[PDB]
Structures are given as structure tokens and as C-alpha cells.
Design a binder for this molecule. Structure first.
Ligand code: LBV
Ligand code: LBV
Lengths: 315, 313
């Protein structure tokens, strides 16, 4: 039965059990994963409102100094570019990316998107023809099976992940592993099927709009935003569009129990519906840098197109 | 059918026999790169472009005996695996060579039956592609998508004019969006008859998605031999981007005052929906890595055109 979200934990909401799966408000956890930092800022003035508690250690500045400046002063070269790329009223799915040379922290990748009147800024550390070669190989795959196999093998070669599966949704939202590339010694998940509650309904809706999410370390504690609520609204900060957003504790326990240290997945979206997932596992924690993740994002789109094409060749 | 090419004493092309020019077998290439053909098994260099000596820095005869194994040691096994016998002519493999005579070359290979076609071009060596991809996806409708696409391509390439040219059901073409330098004519809204892009060129564009003319006044460079030794027949060059452009079509560019021209197929439901069409007033060799960006954009636009057309119908 579909039911509306509970309030999050920090607003006195209940703790999540196997009973109330579908009602966890996973998009507003009030916290991020510790391998990057996040700031929120007023979309018109550029006043800095919220920051992750670890921000001082990524950005090399005291909180009170950060919060006391506008983005115009903090990001003089990027602030006008942000404002042109992310105009008021734009969708929350639109992202702008730049690379910064920050004194204390080396090269940072900056990813920005806009939710209403809020700008959300994510900072992560950042670092030949493999993509072009893959694009052509995907297109020349003769059928859906060969496409799925080429796609899994390519992603594994690009990333070094221990296990890359193509996970396909059935009409009842159960899912099946239809191809996989895996490290020697791992047991096969090919042909296994998994029940619809394994990836509940509000996670699937979010995965139709925001096409990549990850858990770099399945044992890492989440880092709170400070303050936790958006001071504009005294309400929760929407983080569905932020890759740094903390992962559901229910989902992290599910991965730890499987022996997974690091998880990533890309959505494959066909005709406006979530067709499947490029799902990756690693046994140890593992951070895939932003520019490599971009390659996977591009492959997500290519695969969406090629899945349509291969399936049309099939009636 | 097709007329024989000129160099096999076929008729010269007019506006009476537009549909019959064998644009895939011109026997020559554009001079900003070099092409070798080679045997699929032996790696034996069978044809070369008369200009190969320039790019490769090799005494002419040296090449036309040697083997790819010898000539490209690191690459030759990769090719063997990447382009297995029986693969499609559409499948391409690329690498960057740090080659003694020329700082860096791009190498592009595909296979047509028993022949490997190798293309060499100068090359080199950020977020504009990722930023463009998200911009295309958030365009609210087909019109805005067209506008974003043309603007994005112009910004990435510096081309004087970028159009989105859409085919009607009878192959009548319409410029539905345009991004252009100040002080050019506007081709926005104009329609053009189907014969401007003749049937045999639309078919080839459905399979091989990017073509160009780098300089509309440059002479083609012959293949030597012109005929493939294997077959004593013309080498198919339809999947080669270095392939010489139809003089018929180069004349049409010169008459418009264009010095350089590039397009990408937008393919939807197995059919040619439209073209990303680019003009430059002067000669312009777009480097291979930037062309790759446009090739990606072509696929992304193909996806988004279907998405956007579905939310009208
Ligand atoms: C009562 C709640 C439960 C629950 C919740 C939940 N699950 C997700 C997301 C995912 N669950 C996945 C499950 C699988 N992993 C596998 O390897 C296989 C099969 C081989 C299955 C079925 C997967 C893949 C995801 C996607 C994310 C990822 O790839 O790692 C969420 C949302 C997480 C988030 O967005 O932060 C939630 C709340 N899952 C259950 O099984 C029950 C106990
Ligand atoms: C007797 C045949 C004729 C003919 C042949 C021909 N045309 C092409 C390719 C193209 N023609 C194009 C025409 C236009 N360019 C524009 O800018 C506009 C309008 C604003 C039109 C109508 C285009 C866009 C192409 C595609 C290639 C490109 O991007 O430049 C070929 C094929 C050449 C080749 O693939 O090597 C041929 C044989 N064109 C005519 O107009 C008639 C006279």
C-alpha cells in the first residue's frame, strides 16, 4: 500500500523497520557522506546558509568565516557562470559542474544545482578513447543480451568494481540480474530475481529523475548539515539531487550484510520509466572520482537509447 | 543503381543524375589527413594516399610493402580484437599514437569485409559536455531543445553557423533552429527541396553519422592504387571521415560562401530525423577529440528528440 512520507528522524519521525519501508523520507536525511562537503546558498543574494560539519576541512576555512561571506566573494569566477547556467525556476535535475583550484585542498570538483530559491554546492576532490570505443561497440551489439554483456564488461573495465550487474525491472517492480561481470571467486547473481520491496517505491521514483547515486563506504557515519533545517523555510533541505546525500540506514545495513563496502548504480530510463539499473559493488570502500563518474553517466544515456533500439528489434 | 565512378570512365555528374553519384567510392581523401588500407589477416598495406609520406614521415615504397605488425606493434593486436572478421563497417576503433615524425596522431580504423581502413590525423594532449548534456535534458520542449543544441555546438566549436535541419516526410528540409555569428544571412525558417540531400546520401547518413568538408577549395588526394588489389574494385570509403566530398556538393558550399562544413545525423526509430549542420566561412579542421564530443551529442540529441516528441504526441 502506498502511503505518504514520515517526517525525518530529526523532526521526531519514527525509526524505519521492515514494516514502514516505503515511507522513509530518503530525500531529506539532513546529512551527507564524508568524502565531500556541501554548502547551501540563497539563490539571489548568494548568502551561505547551511554547510556540512566537515566543510572547514575541505575548504580550509572556519565556519563563521564561510557563513559570513556571499558566493560572489567566495567564488568570484564561478558565481556569474552559476547564475547564467541555473536560472530561477529551472528544474532541480539540471546540474552545472566546474573544476576549482583551491589553495588548501588541491583540485576540487564543484557540482551545483538549484532547488527553488536554494543553490546546493557539492565539493569533492578530483584527479583515453575508451568511451568512444565503447560507444561504437554498444551500438554494434547484435541483440539485447550481447548489449547487456558488453555494457557490464565495459563498466567493470573502466571502474575496477568487483561486480557490475545489469538489473532489470519487471512490470511488478521485481528485478532480475540479466547480465553481470564479476571478479574471480565471487558467486554469480545472474538469473536471480529479487522482490519489489528490495528497492521500494519512493526510491524508484527518485531514481527516474536523478540518475546516479552511490555509497562510497557502507560503514561511514553521515555528516550533518549545520544548521539541519534550511533557515529560509525552517524546513528540511531537499537533497535528492545531491550525490553526496547520505544513504538510507536501511539500505546500508542491507549492503553490509552482503559484504559490500562500496555501491554505485546508474538508472536506465526508457519511455519515461525506470527500465533497469547499472549496479556496481566493491568489497572494500571505494571512491570513484567525479570525472570517471561522468563517463558512467554518459553510458547510462547511451544504454537507454540502445535498449530502446534493441527492444524495437523484437516484437 | 549507381553510375561507375569517374576514374572507371563513368558519366560526370549533373543535376539530372543527382541520385546516381557513387559518393562512397571516390578513390580519394581530403588532404588534412592520410589513409592506408590493409589486409585483415596479414596486416599488409595494400593502398595508401599519395600524401602518406608527409604525415607518416616514411619513404614512399617502405609503406606499401610493410605490415601493420611491423608498422604499429602495440596497436596491431588491439585492432585484431576490436574489429573481428564479420563485424559491421560502422564499428570503429580509435587510438592516439606518439609517432616520431608527428608529435601525436589520431588513428581511426574500421573494417569492410577483408580490408582494414586506417585514418591518420594530427591530434593533441572539460565539463562543457556534461553541462550540455544536463541542459539538453532540462529543455522543456522540442523548440527549446533545438535552440540549446545549436547554441551548445556553436560554443564548443566556434563554427560560424550551426543549424538544426529537420527532414519532412518527403525529405523536404527545414532549418528549425540556428546559432550564428553576427553578420551572416539567417537560414532559420527556410525550407529546401529533398534533392539537395539526395537519397543515396541520406541512406549513407543513416549508418555513418558524421561527415565534413574541411576546406571547400582543397583538391582531393588519390589512393594508390585506386582499386583494391584484393578485389580489383573500388575501396568503400563511406565509413571514412577523410573520404572526398562530392564535387557537386562542394560546389554548392562554395556558391553559398562556405569554406568548411560539418554535420551530425540525428537518427530516431532507425530513420534519419535531422542533421546538426555546421558552417564556417573559412577552412577549418576540427580536431578528432572535439569531433568525438559532437558524436556524443548526436546520440544524446537522438534520445532527447524522441523523449520530447513523445510529450507532444
Ligand atoms: C525496508 C527497506 C528495505 C530496503 C530499502 C531501500 N533500498 C534502496 C535501494 C536499493 N536496494 C537495492 C537492492 C539490491 N541490491 C542488489 O545487489 C540486489 C540484487 C542482486 C538487490 C535487489 C539496490 C541495488 C538499490 C539501489 C542503490 C544501489 O545500487 O546501491 C533504498 C534507497 C537508497 C538511497 O537512495 O539512498 C532504500 C530505502 N531494501 C530492502 O531490501 C528492505 C530491507
Ligand atoms: C545533384 C545533387 C545535388 C546535391 C548533392 C549532394 N548533397 C550532399 C549533401 C548535403 N547537401 C546539403 C544541403 C544543404 N546545406 C545547407 O546548408 C542547406 C540549407 C540551409 C541545404 C539544403 C547538406 C546539409 C548536406 C549534408 C552534408 C554536410 O553537412 O555538408 C551530398 C553528399 C556529399 C557527401 O556526403 O560527401 C551530395 C552528393 N546537393 C544539391 O544541392 C544538389 C544540387
Amino acid at each position: 500500500d502506498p502511503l505518504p512520507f514520515f517526517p525525518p528522524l530529526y523532526l521526531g519521525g519514527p525509526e524505519i523497520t521492515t514494516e514502514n519501508c516505503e515511507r522513509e523520507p530518503i530525500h531529506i536525511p539532513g546529512s551527507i557522506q564524508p568524502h565531500g562537503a556541501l554548502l547551501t546558498a540563497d539563490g539571489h543574494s548568494g548568502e551561505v546558509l547551511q554547510m556540512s560539519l566537515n566543510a572547514a576541512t575541505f575548504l580550509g576555512q572556519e565556519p563563521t568565516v564561510l557563513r559570513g561571506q556571499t558566493l560572489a566573494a567566495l567564488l568570484p569566477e564561478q558565481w556569474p557562470a552559476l547564475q547564467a547556467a541555473l536560472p530561477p525556476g529551472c528544474p532541480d535535475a539540471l546540474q552545472y559542474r566546474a573544476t576549482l583550484d583551491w589553495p588548501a585542498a588541491g583540485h576540487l570538483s564543484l557540482t551545483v544545482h538549484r532547488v527553488g530559491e536554494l543553490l546546493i554546492l557539492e565539493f569533492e576532490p578530483t584527479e583515453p578513447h575508451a568511451l568512444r570505443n565503447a560507444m561504437f561497440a554498444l551500438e554494434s551489439a547484435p541483440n539485447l543480451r550481447a548489449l547487456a554483456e558488453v555494457a557490464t564488461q565495459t563498466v567493470r573495465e573502466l571502474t575496477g568494481f568487483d561486480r557490475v550487474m545489469l538489473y532489470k525491472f519487471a512490470p511488478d517492480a521485481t528485478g532480475e540480474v540479466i547480465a553481470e561481470a564479476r571478479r574471480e571467486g565471487l558467486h554469480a547473481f545472474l538469473g536471480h530475481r529479487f522482490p519489489a520491496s528490495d528497492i521500494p517505491a519512493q526510491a524508484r521514483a527518485l531514481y527516474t529523475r536523478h540518475l546516479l547515486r552511490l555509497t562510497a563506504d557502507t560503514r561511514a557515519a553521515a555528516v550533518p548539515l549545520d544548521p539541519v533545517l534550511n533557515p529560509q523555510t525552517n524546513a528540511p533541505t531537499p537533497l535528492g539531487g545531491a550525490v553526496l546525500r547520505a544513504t538510507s540506514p536501511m539500505h546500508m545495513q542491507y549492503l553490509r550484510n552482503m559484504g559490500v563496502g562500496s555501491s554505485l548504480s546508474v538508472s536506465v530510463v526508457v519511455g519515461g520509466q525506470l527500465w533497469g539499473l547499472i549496479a556496481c559493488h566493491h568489497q572494500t570502500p571505494y571512491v570513484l572520482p567525479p570525472d570517471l563518474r561522468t563517463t558512467l553517466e554518459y553510458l547510462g544515456r547511451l544504454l537507454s537509447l540502445q535498449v530502446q533500439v534493441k527492444e524495437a528489434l523484437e516484437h
